[PDB]
């Protein structure tokens, strides 16, 4: 079923440990996935003013 922000959520029958490890891995990689505009803002701060 669709999430509010357009993501797809899958409900399945799966293990407690396999679900815990897989979803924790997803959350760790996700916080390092950012939009291009935010990436440009971070780059602009590093480069000189002009």
């Amino acid at each position: 079923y669709p999430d509010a922000d357009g993501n797809d959520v899958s409900i399945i029958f799966s293990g407690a440990m396999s679900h815990a490890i897989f979803t924790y891995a997803q959350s760790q990689w996700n916080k390092n996935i950012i939009k291009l505009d935010d990436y440009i803002r971070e780059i602009t701060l590093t480069v000189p003013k002009q």
């Binding site: 407690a16 815990a20 979803t23 924790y24 997803q26 959350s27 996700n30 916080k31």
Partner: protein, 297 residues
């Protein structure tokens, strides 16, 4: 005339159940898991995903959290709440089965005991202040004792101070300099502050006729506690448990803080054995505060 501290009067007996090695392991396990539960909640709030909280709640409550149902805390919360009730008073029922406690204690392994550390408790015990004729003595306060004394007789009066034998050091300060010395010892010159060891014996303080003298007292007592003990958390847990009504049982005494509770039980007959149960209650209250903050009900 005799004046004594209010919090030291008639300490009610504490519970005699859930004090064995298995029960102590259950309290230590509960504190360890509750701390992880509150740490995951803060990490969960900061980030977008709620994965850390789900895993912590599942370990604590043995069921996955659900949006429709409220987060009660599971069987661990129910066992912890009733065990706290039993410790306070001997009249509180000991209903929680031991097989259920043993099963919960096996969730995690704790490498420690209840006697591997210590904590300083700043509750001043004034067992008695014996005063002669025409000498009014009032004792106010528990963390800081305010002994206001005033005499109307023509001659100076001697007032006996008994601080018990459990406190390590007692610090005395006065509104104006006063003379104090042990029994059968020469009086020193007037000083503003004194440092005393309560084992030294009853202390004699003189009172001039002129103006009232107020003595401010502080004390430090060391009690063996687990290394995970935290005085800030046990104070919050004590207040929360009192508000929740876990201590509403007949023929018991109510205290302002866990500091006064443990000191009053210490200053009683069979006080060494009472204190061990009180320390277990302290760690249980530490777990109760952390869990209730993450799961308010």
């Amino acid at each position: 005339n005799r004046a004594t501290s209010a919090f030291l009067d008639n300490p009610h007996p504490v519970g005699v159940n859930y004090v064995d090695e298995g029960s102590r392991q259950f309290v230590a396990v509960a504190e360890l898991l509750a701390s992880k539960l509150i740490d995951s909640s803060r990490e969960s709030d900061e980030s977008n995903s709620d994965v850390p909280f789900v895993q912590a709640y599942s370990k604590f409550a043995d069921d996955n959290p659900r949006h429709l149902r409220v987060k009660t805390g599971g069987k661990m919360a129910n066992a912890l709440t009733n065990v706290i009730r039993s410790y306070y008073s001997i009249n509180a029922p000991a209903i929680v089965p031991q097989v259920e406690i043993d099963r919960l204690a096996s969730k995690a392994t704790v490498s420690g005991d209840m006697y591997n550390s210590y904590a300083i408790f700043n509750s001043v015990p004034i067992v008695e202040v014996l005063s002669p004729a025409r000498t009014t003595v009032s004792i106010v306060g528990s963390d800081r004792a305010d002994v206001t004394m005033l005499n109307t007789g023509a001659g100076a009066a001697n007032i006996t101070f008994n601080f018990g034998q459990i406190a390590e050091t007692v610090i005395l300060k006065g509104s104006v300099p006063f003379q104090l010395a042990r029994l059968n010892q020469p009086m020193p010159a007037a000083r503003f502050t004194y440092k005393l060891r309560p084992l030294d014996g009853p202390f004699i303080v003189v009172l001039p006729v002129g103006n009232p003298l107020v003595i401010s007292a502080t004390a430090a007592t060391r009690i063996q506690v687990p290394l995970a003990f935290n005085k800030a958390l046990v104070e919050s847990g004590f207040q929360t448990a009192m508000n929740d009504g876990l201590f509403d049982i007949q023929n018991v005494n109510y205290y302002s803080s866990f500091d006064e509770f443990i000191i009053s039980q210490y200053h009683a007959q069979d006080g060494i054995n009472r204190v061990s149960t009180c320390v277990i209650l302290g760690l249980a209250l530490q777990a109760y505060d952390q869990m209730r903050r993450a799961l308010p009900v």
